[PDB]
Amino acid sequence: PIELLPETPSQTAGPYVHIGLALEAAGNPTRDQEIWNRLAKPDAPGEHILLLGQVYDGNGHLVRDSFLEVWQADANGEYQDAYNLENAFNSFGRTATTFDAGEWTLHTVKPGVVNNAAGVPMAPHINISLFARGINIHLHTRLYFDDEAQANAKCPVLNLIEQPQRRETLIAKRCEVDGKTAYRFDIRIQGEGETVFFDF
Amino acid sequence: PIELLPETPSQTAGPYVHIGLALEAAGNPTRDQEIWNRLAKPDAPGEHILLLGQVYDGNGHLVRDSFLEVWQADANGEYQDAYNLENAFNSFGRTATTFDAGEWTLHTVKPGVVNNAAGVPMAPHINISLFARGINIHLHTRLYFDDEAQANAKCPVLNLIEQPQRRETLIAKRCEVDGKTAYRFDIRIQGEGETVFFDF
Amino acid sequence: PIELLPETPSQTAGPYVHIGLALEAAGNPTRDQEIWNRLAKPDAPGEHILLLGQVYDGNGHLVRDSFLEVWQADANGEYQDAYNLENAFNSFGRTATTFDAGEWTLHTVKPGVVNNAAGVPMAPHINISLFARGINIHLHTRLYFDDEAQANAKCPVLNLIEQPQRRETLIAKRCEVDGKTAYRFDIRIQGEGETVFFDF
Amino acid sequence: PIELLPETPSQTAGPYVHIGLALEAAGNPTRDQEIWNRLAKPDAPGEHILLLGQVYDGNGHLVRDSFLEVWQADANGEYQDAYNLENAFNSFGRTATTFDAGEWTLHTVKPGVVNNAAGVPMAPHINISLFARGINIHLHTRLYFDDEAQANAKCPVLNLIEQPQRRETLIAKRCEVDGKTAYRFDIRIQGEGETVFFDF
Amino acid sequence: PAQDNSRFVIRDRNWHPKALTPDYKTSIARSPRQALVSIPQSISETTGPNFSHLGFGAHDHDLLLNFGLPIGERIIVAGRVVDQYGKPVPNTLVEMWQANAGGRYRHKNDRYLAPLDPNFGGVGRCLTDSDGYYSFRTIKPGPYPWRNGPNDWRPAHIHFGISGPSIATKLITQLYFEGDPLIPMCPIVKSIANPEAVQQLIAKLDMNNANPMDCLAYRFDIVLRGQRKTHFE
Amino acid sequence: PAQDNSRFVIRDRNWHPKALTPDYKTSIARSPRQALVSIPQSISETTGPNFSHLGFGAHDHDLLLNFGLPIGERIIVAGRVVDQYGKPVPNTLVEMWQANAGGRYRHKNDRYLAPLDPNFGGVGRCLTDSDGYYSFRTIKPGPYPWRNGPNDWRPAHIHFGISGPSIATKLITQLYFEGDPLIPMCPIVKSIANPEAVQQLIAKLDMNNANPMDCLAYRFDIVLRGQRKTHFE
Amino acid sequence: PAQDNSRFVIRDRNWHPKALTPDYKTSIARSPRQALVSIPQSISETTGPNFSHLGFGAHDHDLLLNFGLPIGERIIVAGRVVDQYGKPVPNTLVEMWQANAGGRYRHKNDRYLAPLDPNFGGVGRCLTDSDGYYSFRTIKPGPYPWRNGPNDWRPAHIHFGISGPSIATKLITQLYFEGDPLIPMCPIVKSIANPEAVQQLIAKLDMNNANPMDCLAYRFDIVLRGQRKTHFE
Numbered sequence A, B, C, D: 001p002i003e004l005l006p007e008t009p010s011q012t013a014g015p016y017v018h019i020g021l022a023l024e025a026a027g028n029p030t031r032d033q034e035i036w037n038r039l040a041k042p043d044a045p046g047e048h049i050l051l052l053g054q055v056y057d058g059n060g061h062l063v064r065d066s067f068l069e070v071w072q073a074d075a076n077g078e079y080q081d082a083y084n085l086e087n088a089f090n091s092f093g094r095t096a097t098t099f100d101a102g103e104w105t106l107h108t109v110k111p112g113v114v115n116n117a118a119g120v121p122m123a124p125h126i127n128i129s130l131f132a133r134g135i136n137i138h139l140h141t142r143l144y145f146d147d148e149a150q151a152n153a154k155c156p157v158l159n160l161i162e163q164p165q166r167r168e169t170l171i172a173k174r175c176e177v178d179g180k181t182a183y184r185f186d187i188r189i190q191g192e193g194e195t196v197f198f199d200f
Numbered sequence E, F, G: 001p002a003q004d005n006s007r008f009v010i011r012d013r014n015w016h017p018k019a020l021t022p023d024y025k026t027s028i029a030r031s032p033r034q035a036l037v038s039i040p041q042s043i044s045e046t047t048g049p050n051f052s053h054l055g056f057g058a059h060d061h062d063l064l065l066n067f068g069l070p071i072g073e074r075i076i077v078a079g080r081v082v083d084q085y086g087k088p089v090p091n092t093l094v095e096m097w098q099a100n101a102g103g104r105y106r107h108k109n110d111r112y113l114a115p116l117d118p119n120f121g122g123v124g125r126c127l128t129d130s131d132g133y134y135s136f137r138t139i140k141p142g143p144y145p146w147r148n149g150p151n152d153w154r155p156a157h158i159h160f161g162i163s164g165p166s167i168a169t170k171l172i173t174q175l176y177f178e179g180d181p182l183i184p185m186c187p188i189v190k191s192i193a194n195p196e197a198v199q200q201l202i203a204k205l206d207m208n209n210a211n212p213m214d215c216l217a218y219r220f221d222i223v224l225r226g227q228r229k230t231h232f233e
């Protein structure tokens, strides 16, 4: 068969990922412009939300050194690929778990609907990449919203997961934080209620 | 050492096993003669019973595409190897789990006692071979009856299982279905209450 | 792919073939029973005929050392394989070309029709194998009769020859010898009007 | 020495070439635009002529599965490379021999004179490429006109053919068809009158 | 009834694929975590059904007629069933199933876009003869995509089921075709750790058995566990 | 009009199959007995048709749509056309024809018993792009028996025709599929004396180009005679 | 009468010597120029004579007594006749002829100066037994000069003819003797392209079969076309 150049092999980010990608967290001075957890500016169109979660290992222990990268469409279901701090909305963000509480947060808007390659609409979702020491190759997942039951039921992606019980691992639970709309998305790397992780 | 020709290597039956072995199940036209789940004709000697069960995976999820093969003695404890649809009783049978409910059924008679190689009587049992996608090499098990406690206690086979707790996994639970004597035999492939599987 | 043991390789019969297969010809004492050129006994049913011909090399020169074997059905279109000198008819015979004249002769009957594998009748024909010094592997051919034009036209074998002009090479020309029905069948190994040779 | 990438090796067109290159001939539906045997439209400048011929094998038997490609200058001795069905004249065409009659035909104009690399005029000619089952690599030939004997005599290409007699094999014979100017150009692949084939 | 007169060579569980072969995704949740319990052979395990009296239809083994002619490569799949000692296994049941020429299976659950072939069922059964020989006539199956990795394709294959002399010999395998480049990339093939074991599943082109101007042939010999008489028991 | 501005590397007639290759029976009577006559390249030989303005249909290159869906292995056949110097051959005409999944050709002369596919024609054409790339969408053809020796079978193949920048470059060839065991047995293939040359006709399985859950892909690059500018002529 | 119940593996015309082998001078004018025409097997080709009822003389197979005692090396020439499947060919006609110890043939046309042996004929016949075995007792033939190249010599050889079950299997060949230095120099031997095929014609010294203080023995096995039953025809 035909073989291309092999891709550079992945390696765990290690426990010091923060020094390179989450300066503040590392307890280091940050530079002028940093890629962080505030996707939307107050004046950004859409429903402003707060996302938060915890990461658990197979022992049910918090993973306090995790690093997360997110990709989502704006409120109009459009991917804003031109990253700029001046933008009212950025499709890309970064977050990390606190060494204390071990909880990450993100400030964004609920994404609009986008269609799959076959033209079928996907339920509103946020694409998540999880990195950490102990993780050889980043884990891919999707965050869906519990208040999009109808859309969720028809998602061609959610539907690819054979076991319905497993689908539930991808649904963030709507809540309120200081009277603000928030969604909690905990990730269970392993065991009971282990989060669905994708390959693409 | 002496090396014989190597036995042809096993491969999973795959999801479509029905097309070959359970025509009616695959939703295909059957042939004149099929090997199915009715080992005994109504007029066959012995206690007529119904067997039923579900097969679960390591997640506790139903295995809806399983294929099962059975081998048992007649009421006299005799293995009738000459397979004929004309016979009142056949020692061999086949069944599969419904793609809906996920339960298989077998219509037979309670097997009579059979002695092991050393002349010790085994408790009444039905030999089972489990096949399905995800199963590289079929799983062998045995179904014993909860109403043969006395006999079960002395089974030389049952007694080979180190942990008594695991012996219970092979005991089918007597019930009644439509005023008929039935036994439920669930198979747990993996995890909590994992069914004993044999090598021979 | 699967390989069988290789067939033993052919070799030319050489110029002295006669010593082993045409004793009379080699000018040596014959044995009690010889396989020769008289397939039919006077009292054999069917139309008794005389076959005769010459063999030409690529230069148009007579091949005076050829050895031929023939296989044909009897008048009833039946193959008589049980060779016996006592038979009124034998399906097998042998002949050779005179070192002088360079002509061979055979005494037989006109063969009845036989069907090919597909159940289609073949025109009356005599199967021939030609041997000789200079011939590494014997040549296979068929002898058809000029007076069976109807049948010849329908021969599924004769019809396999692409060029109609080549088909003519297989047709023996009826003649009379001392008021006896004869057919002359000359073989041109190579060149102008080269005889059709088969592979089967 | 310096070696470049080797050219993909040729393979015979096979007997079904028509399917890909002579749809009408294969007796299959054609597409909107087909490359065929009419190089010139009625209103194309130059002397309109009909080309026809038969192709013979080594045995003098007609090759009925042959495929031909032609390349010629227009009447002004110009090679029109931009192929377009809209054009009055196309320098390129395709033809094939009938499965019945086994004759090909081409509708064009007599090509004007073109100079060779040395700036020497070549006699009016049509470049031909012959393809068919049994031909591993296509044969290249040139069609010259019997009515251009003066030009023919000075052709730097014709002159490369050592033997005068072989030169004759390239000359088309002027005829009339329905009072139309025609030239017959029979190709003899092998034997007596074997057509000169080129390498370039 | 059946008699406990035989013993079967113990299976080599390192030769056969292991239960847990992560690359074959489904194997994860469908593999035991406890070790199998070994048990001595008894009449229960050393006997099995004999299908001699099963009433087989005329074209049970001819996939070309048992369902117009199917579209695809006409082939004969033939071989012999023998035990580890090289002894023929006569009158044994051989069952097979496959996809059509496009890799489409005639089963409810097959949603692959390759269309069904109106003249193709894809099921056959044959009882080996006196000499352990069996033969089928069918069309070569096409490979097909499956939801394992994002770009997994099973090599063209035929599913096989062989009864043998007892439930201890009973086996389900897959036949693969000689030279298929998909073979080495298949996670299911790869459930088999030893390359030599993989070789045993590859059918070889067999020109000797082909019918000229008709169909080709493939040879697939099957080896069942060695059968021996009991001794000094 | 066209201009004589290029020379083409002389063909290696020891690399290409010879005219007389007796195992391919037909070549005997259809091969010259006289030596070919070499002639210098002139405008007649160094020019040829340019098909850029040919009006191609939407599915000219899609054998799945250009004639239901055909039964068979869905594949994409793609590659690049380059010259001996490794230079892409843009806007060049690539035509192809082949049998259906069973080895049956849609031609009046084909009497093989495998049936026709109501949805399959077997013809495609594609103009290489700016980079010399072409692609076809089809079904993998079946091998087929032919009247050569008594048991001859063409390996699965796709016939190809390539124009190139000139008549000097025009070529007709066959694409064979990686691992086909029939390949080494073919008298036509074997018309090629050099095994290295045979390798160049073997399309390789290209998983990188496959459409997951849809079709496989084969890669077939073609090399035409290297083209150079004339110098010191 | 005979019945068409068998098929014969197709002959490998590259294994056997070709017709045109220019070094063997006579072959030039005695080889066809047209290709052989392949035809399907029918009752005509799959049947042949059975010599079981031929009335053989007591010393038909004993060249030491079938014509004093001849001068030369007493040897038994024995072997088995089997088909490609390794099945024995019982009751088949094996005929042999050879020169004397001096390489002189008892044929009018032989004018070689080596003398004739008053007690040596040079002809034998033997019907193979139930196990496909045959045997001859003779003297080892001498090499002989032949008019081919200016100094050509045939290695010592014994000519063989074998009937087999049909005219399809019938074969004529030559046995050579293990270690003979003339072998590799013989243009007749060399008509065989493959060195491996040549090896098949070499009779091996067989001390196991020799009669101590009497005669030596050579083993020469013959393989005829594999015979199989028709199927799906």
Ligand SMILES: O=C(O)c1ccc(O)c(Cl)c1
Pocket (backbone or CB within 6 Å): A012, A013, A014, A015, A133, A134
């Ligand atoms: O503890 C770890 O996992 C660890 C420590 C250092 C380091 O560089 C990496 Cl990549 C990992």
Ligand SMILES: O=C(O)c1ccc(O)c(Cl)c1
Pocket (backbone or CB within 6 Å): B012, B013, B014, B015, B133, B134, E026, E146, E147, E154, E188
């Ligand atoms: O999904 C699976 O496990 C699967 C699919 C197809 C197939 O042939 C096999 Cl063996 C397995």
Ligand SMILES: O=C(O)c1ccc(O)c(Cl)c1
Pocket (backbone or CB within 6 Å): C012, C013, C014, C015, C133, C134, G026, G146, G147, G154, G188
């Ligand atoms: O002259 C010949 O062709 C010749 C001579 C002797 C001999 O043994 C053979 Cl096989 C051939």
Ligand SMILES: O=C(O)c1ccc(O)c(Cl)c1
Pocket (backbone or CB within 6 Å): D012, D013, D014, D015, D133, D134, F026, F146, F147, F154, F188
């Ligand atoms: O008969 C022939 O020459 C023939 C048949 C089939 C085929 O694919 C080719 Cl290239 C040639």
Ligand SMILES: O=C(O)c1ccc(O)c(Cl)c1
Pocket (backbone or CB within 6 Å): E018, E019, E020, E032, E033, E034, E035
């Ligand atoms: O075969 C294995 O790898 C295997 C078997 C049992 C078990 O519990 C584990 Cl973790 C692994």
Ligand SMILES: O=C(O)c1ccc(O)c(Cl)c1
Pocket (backbone or CB within 6 Å): F018, F019, F020, F032, F033, F034, F035
């Ligand atoms: O290539 C060959 O073998 C070849 C070419 C021409 C010719 O006349 C002969 Cl006899 C042979």
Ligand SMILES: O=C(O)c1ccc(O)c(Cl)c1
Pocket (backbone or CB within 6 Å): F022, F028, G018, G019, G020, G032, G033, G034, G035
């Ligand atoms: O085998 C050969 O070399 C061969 C066969 C036929 C034929 O016509 C020619 Cl010229 C050569």
Ligand SMILES: [Fe+3]
Pocket (backbone or CB within 6 Å): A014, A016
């Ligand atoms: Fe580090």
Ligand SMILES: [Fe+3]
Pocket (backbone or CB within 6 Å): B014, B016, E154, E159
């Ligand atoms: Fe499958």
Ligand SMILES: [Fe+3]
Pocket (backbone or CB within 6 Å): C014, C016, G154, G157, G159
């Ligand atoms: Fe000799």
Ligand SMILES: [Fe+3]
Pocket (backbone or CB within 6 Å): D014, D016, F154, F157, F159
């Ligand atoms: Fe073809």
